[PDB]
């Protein structure tokens, strides 16, 4: 069957300011089929109680989801997302870079 | 301006793991306003915008009834599709449907939509005439013959020209504080050296609604289409959207580059440069 | 609001 690999972006709701509460987002889009697993990571460990949007899709039928959690960025703490999908031979980790 | 209403539906079979999962969401423009998920403990259509919360219990009862009926129809359709494509009962498959309407700033119908996809591929679509069908393949032609015999297009047309437009009008008025407010992008340009010879200029648009936007870079007034990295417009989680466009520039040539931003919240498109 | 009628494939 035809499959489409997810586009992945990891980013914050507001421009990051160290010590100020914010939201960390992982937007996965452009994928098919719809089963997908997304973790948000803090210093390499899974963040608990991450929420996500309800499955929807774009005009080309490809799916998108937003995964999100409240966070307070600091200078030292590293954040990332880890995405698995049938199209991936291994999970893909994308690091949060406050400039992207 | 113009506006849209859309209902999106996804059914995903999972043999050996119960009945197909069904999830449906409704949007006005880029605003989610209702959702239903068959895997919720006691599934009901739920509001997702403040302006729909005033609809009474009967609204939610009718909506929930339709959601469950649509889930059931999709279960039948998924079994049928296995037959039409000579497929095993072992695999997971997906059925997607969208319908709705676009209206102009006067509230008049621009056009209606009703379309279906199987395993991520177009299957059958109602044409813009709201009277005839486009079938993607010989399987979908079987559906087309069935739906022609049943005059299904006629009922869809009546809904799309009538209730779809009327209810969209209602929602726009009830949500006039938000649905009829465009939030312009907040824009800036950042500069990141890559080497002694080149740097990235990234043009940012933040906090905008609706999501439609155009961000372009020009060099000496020429669009840099092939050399611009554009990310997909992405949701911030506070209703608004974000996007950026980047170009790699020779060091010293930064002032030859201009970022151009078009958004319906802007009275005139903006031109930005890196401001060191 | 949603439509009332549909037909399976
Ligand atoms: Cl329906």
PDB file of C-alpha atoms in Angstrom, chain A residues 1-2 7 9 11-15 25 27 29 32-35 54-64 66 98-100, chain B residues 8-10 12 23 25 27 35 92-94 96-97 115-117 119-120 122 192 202 204 231-237 242 244:
ATOM      1  CA  UNK A   1       0.000   0.000   0.000  1.00  0.00           C
ATOM      2  CA  UNK A   2       1.075   3.613  -0.562  1.00  0.00           C
ATOM      3  CA  UNK A   7       6.903  15.840   8.426  1.00  0.00           C
ATOM      4  CA  UNK A   9       8.383  20.047  13.661  1.00  0.00           C
ATOM      5  CA  UNK A  11       8.741  24.176  18.573  1.00  0.00           C
ATOM      6  CA  UNK A  12       7.269  26.345  21.300  1.00  0.00           C
ATOM      7  CA  UNK A  13       3.939  28.192  21.379  1.00  0.00           C
ATOM      8  CA  UNK A  14       5.654  31.463  22.360  1.00  0.00           C
ATOM      9  CA  UNK A  15       9.229  32.626  21.858  1.00  0.00           C
ATOM     10  CA  UNK A  25       4.681  21.298  20.565  1.00  0.00           C
ATOM     11  CA  UNK A  27       3.449  18.846  14.888  1.00  0.00           C
ATOM     12  CA  UNK A  29       1.818  16.137   9.293  1.00  0.00           C
ATOM     13  CA  UNK A  32      -0.371   8.018   5.925  1.00  0.00           C
ATOM     14  CA  UNK A  33      -1.471   5.648   7.424  1.00  0.00           C
ATOM     15  CA  UNK A  34      -2.740   7.362  10.546  1.00  0.00           C
ATOM     16  CA  UNK A  35      -1.153   5.207  13.228  1.00  0.00           C
ATOM     17  CA  UNK A  54      -7.910  14.771  17.374  1.00  0.00           C
ATOM     18  CA  UNK A  55      -6.943  13.149  14.096  1.00  0.00           C
ATOM     19  CA  UNK A  56      -7.733  15.319  11.104  1.00  0.00           C
ATOM     20  CA  UNK A  57      -6.471  15.561   7.592  1.00  0.00           C
ATOM     21  CA  UNK A  58      -5.463  17.925   4.808  1.00  0.00           C
ATOM     22  CA  UNK A  59      -6.839  18.410   1.316  1.00  0.00           C
ATOM     23  CA  UNK A  60      -4.532  15.701  -0.031  1.00  0.00           C
ATOM     24  CA  UNK A  61      -5.951  13.266   2.608  1.00  0.00           C
ATOM     25  CA  UNK A  62      -2.706  13.156   4.585  1.00  0.00           C
ATOM     26  CA  UNK A  63      -3.032  13.244   8.364  1.00  0.00           C
ATOM     27  CA  UNK A  64      -1.827  15.746  10.965  1.00  0.00           C
ATOM     28  CA  UNK A  66      -0.340  18.200  17.367  1.00  0.00           C
ATOM     29  CA  UNK A  98      14.481  27.626  20.013  1.00  0.00           C
ATOM     30  CA  UNK A  99      15.527  29.249  16.687  1.00  0.00           C
ATOM     31  CA  UNK A 100      13.291  26.927  14.620  1.00  0.00           C
TER      32      UNK A 100
ATOM     33  CA  UNK B   8     -13.963  15.442   8.399  1.00  0.00           C
ATOM     34  CA  UNK B   9     -14.315  11.736   9.154  1.00  0.00           C
ATOM     35  CA  UNK B  10     -11.758   8.920   9.479  1.00  0.00           C
ATOM     36  CA  UNK B  12      -9.549   2.923  10.535  1.00  0.00           C
ATOM     37  CA  UNK B  23     -12.969  10.017  14.625  1.00  0.00           C
ATOM     38  CA  UNK B  25     -14.140  16.733  13.671  1.00  0.00           C
ATOM     39  CA  UNK B  27     -14.298  23.176  11.499  1.00  0.00           C
ATOM     40  CA  UNK B  35     -15.341  16.372  17.873  1.00  0.00           C
ATOM     41  CA  UNK B  92      -5.877  -2.295   8.452  1.00  0.00           C
ATOM     42  CA  UNK B  93      -7.532   0.066   5.982  1.00  0.00           C
ATOM     43  CA  UNK B  94      -8.685   3.649   6.111  1.00  0.00           C
ATOM     44  CA  UNK B  96     -11.945   9.186   4.917  1.00  0.00           C
ATOM     45  CA  UNK B  97     -14.803  11.515   4.070  1.00  0.00           C
ATOM     46  CA  UNK B 115     -15.545  13.485  -1.194  1.00  0.00           C
ATOM     47  CA  UNK B 116     -14.216  10.146  -0.069  1.00  0.00           C
ATOM     48  CA  UNK B 117     -10.803   8.446  -0.013  1.00  0.00           C
ATOM     49  CA  UNK B 119      -6.295   4.067   1.995  1.00  0.00           C
ATOM     50  CA  UNK B 120      -5.300   7.663   1.441  1.00  0.00           C
ATOM     51  CA  UNK B 122      -9.192   9.532  -3.866  1.00  0.00           C
ATOM     52  CA  UNK B 192      22.455  32.846  11.886  1.00  0.00           C
ATOM     53  CA  UNK B 202      14.899  33.346   8.557  1.00  0.00           C
ATOM     54  CA  UNK B 204       9.206  34.539  10.915  1.00  0.00           C
ATOM     55  CA  UNK B 231       8.178  25.011   6.692  1.00  0.00           C
ATOM     56  CA  UNK B 232       4.551  23.898   6.780  1.00  0.00           C
ATOM     57  CA  UNK B 233       2.258  26.325   8.552  1.00  0.00           C
ATOM     58  CA  UNK B 234       1.896  24.972  12.042  1.00  0.00           C
ATOM     59  CA  UNK B 235      -0.507  25.470  14.904  1.00  0.00           C
ATOM     60  CA  UNK B 236       0.672  27.298  18.060  1.00  0.00           C
ATOM     61  CA  UNK B 237      -2.083  25.755  20.249  1.00  0.00           C
ATOM     62  CA  UNK B 242       3.265  30.041  12.779  1.00  0.00           C
ATOM     63  CA  UNK B 244       8.968  30.664   8.597  1.00  0.00           C
TER      64      UNK B 244
END
